[PDB]
Inverse folding.
């Protein structure tokens, strides 16, 4: 049922994913390596569950993985601990395919949402770079109008990637920037609009109202907009990103998730729990510094690289 | 000023405070590195500082609901004092987070029967061993019961703790009825005039129905001997997993009536801020925290001293 966002990987892309999950992969193996001795018995399975919890895979997800693994091991007379790598890869890949919400007119308008410090502006810059590389005309909108760092960074991305940016002085109405952005995009025959927005969990009411107003105003120009609402999450915080995402997706309509900062963390297993539990697909993962290291998501390849 | 909340440990020996300081140092250093970015180019605590502080607290495993409450308290502080300079921010965090922990009415406060619940691991059996050591060092007669009867490692480890500490243990062959072990343990404690019983119980989260049923059967059977038992239901959590411990506690506290929490393994994690979120959010008190390897490093909890050590100057 699940059809991943990226079905064919170049050799360089698979290597980037391998290296991006290497810290999490080594950390998980270091834990399961210490957890043992020769045969997979229930003491090993209890210990492996603790390892999965300790690797930020998540409680609800870990329980389902262990449940399926317990059934598989309870089939053959004996299972050597060497088989753990293969059993983990096969059962977790199958689980991720069980979530029906996983996987898959101009301008296409993307509203990027999330809190400060998660990697929103870098994600916008990389998306702009990728779309332009496909021949698409991109316009950026700096609708986080009260945070100078966000506007400054988006300006730098617009100059580095070579795409126009629509912005206004600090403190302007974000809905006015969003309107101007989509109006400018229509007049310039742009293919893609990417809107940066302010984000914060405290004062959630005001946040929800601002996001609804931004959408309402853009719909005056492009009735289908936003076509995508992309929530950016910091994977280096592990399950903290999961609960933070739970808050945003209930406060406003999100259509896709991006999980950043996986290469420098040992907590990348949170992607498995997010893909398993959320009713919104993981669409992008950040696995390195390159523009192409914001990868479209494939849970089967992710699980393969995690347990390499 | 009287407070409804009364911490479990109000006076710290210098070595106990030093252990708490050292046990939270990894989490403390990690928080201070992160918050340093929130005040770059800033002179006063403004909206942007608070936005950045929100993500710092989230990234520190404090949890969304508690983080929002902290930010709200700081906003009220900034309005009370008109302005707060960023140099004062650490002092504000200490004061406001300490005040917040005192807002939870569920925080703080023979034989005495302790039923220990939680997921499998050395943390739970080590917590039992350390409690037995502490009670015996106070002069109390302790009896242990190994009612996780299908997990050989848990029973064996508890037997070893009984020999290390020098207390009796009640156990049965692997695969025996946990209710029979629990019955035997309390009956033995009554006969030997014990002060404290500590019973280990199985805790697999897979089948919550079977978990809820086994734990209630264990309680009912002990009540045949000691009608008030269990006097304490202690849920042991691994704080080194951060907010995962919060989620795991949500699971256990729904399956049975839990009366107290122990959060272990704080010394080696940067995720110790989860204790702040647990204390603020749960309707069960944090009673013990594990801040090191020594027997005395399983400390009775004091949220004010915890915050002091976490945000130490």
């Amino acid at each position: 049922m699940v059809s991943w966002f990226k079905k064919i990987f170049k050799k360089e892309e698979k290597e980037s994913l391998d290296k991006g999950l290497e810290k999490s992969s080594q950390s998980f193996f270091d834990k399961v390596s210490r957890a043992v001795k020769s045969k997979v018995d229930d003491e090993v399975l209890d210990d492996l569950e603790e390892v999965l919890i300790a690797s930020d895979v998540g409680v609800e997800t870990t329980v389902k993985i262990i449940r399926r693994i317990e059934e598989r091991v309870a089939r053959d007379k004996y299972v050597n601990v060497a088989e753990l790598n293969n059993i983990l890869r096969e059962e977790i890949s199958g689980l991720l395919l069980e979530n029906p919400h996983a996987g898959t007119k101009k301008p296409y308008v993307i509203m990027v949402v999330g809190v400060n410090g998660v990697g929103k502006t870098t994600t916008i810059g990389k998306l702009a770079h990728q779309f332009k590389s496909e021949g698409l005309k991109v316009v950026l909108g700096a609708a986080d109008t009260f945070r100078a760092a966000a506007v400054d960074q988006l300006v730098i991305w617009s100059e580095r990637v070579g795409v126009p940016i629509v912005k206004q002085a600090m403190g302007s109405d974000p809905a006015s920037v969003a309107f101007d952005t989509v109006q400018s995009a229509v007049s310039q025959d742009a293919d893609v609009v990417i809107i940066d927005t302010a984000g914060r969990l405290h004062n959630k009411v005001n946040l929800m109202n601002e996001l609804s107003k931004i959408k309402r105003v853009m719909q005056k120009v492009v009735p289908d907009a936003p076509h995508e609402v992309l929530l950016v999450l910091d994977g280096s915080t592990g399950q903290n990103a999961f609960e933070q995402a739970k808050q945003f997706t209930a406060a406003t309509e999100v259509t896709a998730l991006a999980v950043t900062k996986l290469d420098g963390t040992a907590r990348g297993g949170v992607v498995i729990g997010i893909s398993d539990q959320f009713q919104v697909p993981v669409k992008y993962i950040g696995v390195g510094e390159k523009m192409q290291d914001l990868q479209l998501f494939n849970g089967t390849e992710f699980v393969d690289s995690f347990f390499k």
User: Anything to note?
Assistant: Chain A is about 50% helix and 10% strand. The interface with chain B takes residues 42-43, 46, 49-50, 53-54, 56, 58-59, 63, 66-67, 115-118, 146-147, 200-202, 204, 234, 236-240, 243-244, 247 of chain A (CB under 8 Å).
